A paper describes a structure:
We wondered whether the sequence dissimilarity induced structural differences that could account for the different aggregation tendencies of the MDM2 variants and performed protein crystallization for MDM2f and MDM2z. We obtained crystals for MDM2z and MDM2f, which diffracted to 2.87 and 2.27 Å, respectively. The unit cell for the MDM2z crystal contains two molecules of MDM2z, which form a dimer. The overall structure is similar to MDM2h (RMSD of 0.6 Å), where all secondary structure elements and the coordination of zinc ions are conserved. There was no electron density for the first 11 residues (407–417, corresponding to 423–433 in MDM2h), which are located N-terminal to the RING domain and partly involved in the formation of a 310-helix in MDM2h. A possible explanation for this observation could be the sequence difference for residues preceding the RING domain, which form a 310-helix in MDM2h but lack electron density in all MDM2f and MDM2z structures reported in this study. The helices are stabilized by a tight hydrophobic packing arrangement involving residues A434 and F490 of each protomer. In MDM2f and MDM2z, A434 is replaced with serine and cysteine, respectively. Both serine and cysteine would likely cause a steric clash and their polar side chains would disrupt the hydrophobic packing, thereby precluding a similar helical arrangement.
The importance of the ubiquitin ligase murine double mutant 2 (MDM2) as a key negative regulator of the tumour suppressor protein p53 has been studied extensively. Second, it promotes the proteasomal degradation of p53 by recruiting Ub conjugating enzyme (E2) thioesterified with ubiquitin (E2~Ub; ~ indicates thioester bond) via its RING domain and mediates ubiquitin (Ub) transfer from E2 to p53,8 where Ub is preferentially conjugated to lysine residues located in the C-terminal lysine rich region of p53.9 Although the relative importance of these mechanisms is context dependent, in vivo mouse studies with ligase defective MDM2 resulted in the same lethality as MDM2 knockout experiments. The RING domain of MDM2 has been discussed as an alternative target to stabilize p53.19 The rationale for this approach lies in MDM2′s ability to still bind and inhibit p53 when MDM2-mediated ubiquitination is abolished, thereby preventing uncontrolled activation of p53.8 The RING domain gains its E3 ligase activity through dimerization with either itself or the RING domain of its catalytic inactive homologue MDMX to form a homodimer or heterodimer, respectively. The dimeric RING domain arrangement is essential for E2~Ub binding and activation as demonstrated by co-crystal structures with UbcH5B–Ub (en dash indicates covalent complex).
Residue numbers in the entry:
A (entry chain BBB), B (entry chain AAA): 418 to 475
């Protein structure tokens, strides 16, 4: 799916939720960051967001 | 791009090259890891690979 950020649905999925050595890409960097600041869990696995990487394709 | 890992072209781009708080997604986790172990640079920006995240799209 080339579908947008699942939260805002207005921006691309370029906000990578890192937990250790695995990452989940369902949200934009800006949305995924708000989740971490407001102490929400990863929507994919409900595991704490350790950090957020701004991800660029090619 | 729905195109495969630029190195092996046999696995998806699920190997996120992290440098600071930005990541580059052009290679598979296994290919991007070999780059880090053999002290190669990020093919996108020729900046050192600080870590590699195994990324899952949802
Ligand atoms: Zn968003
Ligand atoms: Zn997760
Ligand atoms: Zn590869
Ligand atoms: Zn790079």
């Amino acid at each position: 799916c080339l579908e947008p950020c699942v939260i805002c649905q207005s921006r691309p999925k370029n906000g990578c939720i890192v937990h250790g050595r695995t990452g989940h890409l369902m949200a934009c960097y800006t949305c995924a960051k708000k989740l971490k600041n407001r102490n929400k869990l990863c929507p994919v696995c409900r595991e704490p967001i350790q950090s957020v990487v701004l991800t660029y394709m090619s």
